[PDB]
């Protein structure tokens, strides 16, 4: 039909390998998925149907008003602002649109929870929701201690619904743990909520999310996430298929992270 349905999307997910009980991190382009009856909310319903009440869904929500670049690497932050930057509120603050409209609807799903790192904020729904979303500290955006580390430890799977291979966020965790030199770092500041005296701008120091090494940080050229995912795809371990009208991928998170660490060691462990 012109519009896929909750049930037809659930069938496509199952055919791609999603199973009841799974922990799924989703990156979607809902335009690639195409019209579904009831819109993006019905895509969440289908995913929930696919993983059952025991499964957990997860998404990279971030924040539509994050001051990442405005505070990046000791930038003179322009107090022209006079600090009326909107506070990061877990329930009301918007998601970063670049990571997909679906994260807004995961947030609206029943009993969904959201992590407190404003720039790296994660949404999760299901038994593992609090486990995944707490703790989430400045300086632990995507690496050790982050929700990504626990997503990998709990056997998560990465679902791309028409999103490109560079959107595989769990490979930022592989970047963080890979025993190689010359890894790039950044610094920025975020409005925290500390000892309930409102906003306290606090500082983070973390690995660079836009290029872990110099050669991966060039514009117009593949970053490490894309480079590694493409190389991993050649093994034929992942699953591919259509969901709705979107070319889609399902990856085992432990395996692609382990591949990514191996890849980075074999290629950049020399310097
Ligand atoms: Mg369990």
Numbering used by the authors: -1 to 269
Task: Share the article's original sentences.
Here, we conduct a comprehensive functional analysis of the Antibiotic_NAT family of aminoglycoside acetyltransferases. AG resistance is primarily conferred by three classes of aminoglycoside-modifying enzymes (AMEs): phosphotransferases (APHs), nucleotidylyltransferases (ANTs), and acetyltransferases (AACs). AMEs permanently alter the AG substrate, preventing them from binding to their target, the A-site of the 16S rRNA in the bacterial ribosome. The fold typical of the Antibiotic_NAT family is evident in all structures, composed of 13 α-helices and 8 β-strands, and determined structures superpose with pairwise RMSD’s 0.8–1.0 Å between 197 to 266 matching Cα atoms.
The crystal structure of AAC(3)-IIb represents the first molecular image of enzymes with AAC(3)-II activity. Its structure superimposes with RMSD 0.7 Å over 221 Cɑ atoms with the previously characterized AAC(3)-VIa structure, consistent with our phylogenetic analysis placing both these enzymes in the group 4 of the Antibiotic_NAT family. Similarly to the AAC(3)-VIa enzyme, the minor subdomain loop of AAC(3)-IIb contains the conserved Asn208, which is predicted to clash with substituents at position 5 of the AG substrate, thereby explaining the lack of activity toward 4,5-disubstituted AGs. Other notable amino acids in the active site of AAC(3)-IIa that may restrict the size and positioning of AG substrates include Tyr66, positioned near the binding location of the double prime ring, and Phe97, positioned near the central 2-deoxystreptamine ring. Altogether, AAC(3)-IIb—like AAC(3)-VIa—harbors a more restricted active site, consistent with its limited AG specificity. The crystal structure of AAC(3)-IIb features an active site highly like that of AAC(3)-VIa, consistent with the 4,6-disubstituted specificity of Group 4 enzymes. Finally, AAC(3)-IIb was monomeric both in the crystal structure and in solution (not shown). Insert 3 forms a two-stranded antiparallel β-sheet while corresponding to a short α-helix found only in AAC(3)-IIb structure. Representatives of Antibiotic_NAT Groups 2 and 4 were the most restricted in their specificity, and this was reflected in more constrained and smaller active sites, as revealed by the structures of AAC(3)-IIb and AAC(3)-Xa.
